[PDB]
Amino acid sequence: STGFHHADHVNYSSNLNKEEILEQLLLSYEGLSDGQVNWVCNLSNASSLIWHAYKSLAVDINWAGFYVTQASEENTLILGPFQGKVACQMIQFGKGVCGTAASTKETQIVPDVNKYPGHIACDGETKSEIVVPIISNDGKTLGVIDIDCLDYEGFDHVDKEFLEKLAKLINKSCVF
Amino acid sequence: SSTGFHHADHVNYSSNLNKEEILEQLLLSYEGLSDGQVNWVCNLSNASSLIWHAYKSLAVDINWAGFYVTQASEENTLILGPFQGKVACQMIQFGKGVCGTAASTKETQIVPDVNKYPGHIACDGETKSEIVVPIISNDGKTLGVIDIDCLDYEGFDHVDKEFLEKLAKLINKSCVF
């Protein structure tokens, strides 16, 4: 018996710094997703990792989750696992921060969503947001990683760098 | 013409509402949130958030609220689905643990002390009590389970079972697994 439980992956002392917490998160995601390619499973645990990591970082986040490119027709993002309050069910590519990340295949960092044309708010209290797209081997958008913050300008290049790595791990470990 | 509401508002209500009001409001929110699509991931993800916040406001110290769904490839195995809480076990075999037994017996399991539960599979070592409600198909088979963990012993009772079994039926009719 290791003495550990799955839940233990989300322990981060206030004494750890940001680089460490995020490094541990990637490693935990790797350990937890090694066993199955089931994307719901891996993304669900992934959302918890992200949520808890950010709560430990003292970034006041209110949502941490994923939308996945709908299996049906013309690219639409459909709500996937998340930690946080009830969210919008579907987003068309090109619409809002998530839809913009999906059409551009690029990371979006929004310092104030009320000054962002076309913003699609799922939580009225969200002030800033970061969206990182999950790209497949053939370079198509598979879904996005989306984090909201209750304060303006909550995210920067460090979050983008970490999230982009996590998106790579996700594509290599999940089957959509 | 903005309604002035946001999706998140389904989980924004006073904790001064009594339990029957809160649970009845949850069933109504799930219905309105799931009307537009049969996608089960979307529907169970918002569901997990509804359940989590309802119990937080009822002042039950829960640590997990979520779902497991029967693996398509194998109808005797549960695969981790959407949830609110800490990282959890990825797969559970029918007949094993509280979740696996709710699935094999097709009966709600209300557990006051998880460590007195033979074969308990702890995803969170701090879980002390738990309730698992199986989601049943028209065909009468287990589609998955609704799973809630609590940090204190004796956190659940049959009113929870009654409302969660209604929710499970709404999930079956609203989702395509």
Ligand SMILES: [Br-]
């Ligand atoms: Br849209």
Ligand SMILES: [Br-]
């Ligand atoms: Br504007």
Ligand SMILES: [Br-]
């Ligand atoms: Br694409």
Ligand SMILES: [Br-]
């Ligand atoms: Br990759």
Ligand SMILES: [Br-]
């Ligand atoms: Br209210």
Ligand SMILES: [Br-]
């Ligand atoms: Br009651």
Ligand SMILES: [Br-]
């Ligand atoms: Br098992």
Ligand SMILES: [Br-]
């Ligand atoms: Br009681």
Ligand SMILES: [Br-]
């Ligand atoms: Br009902």
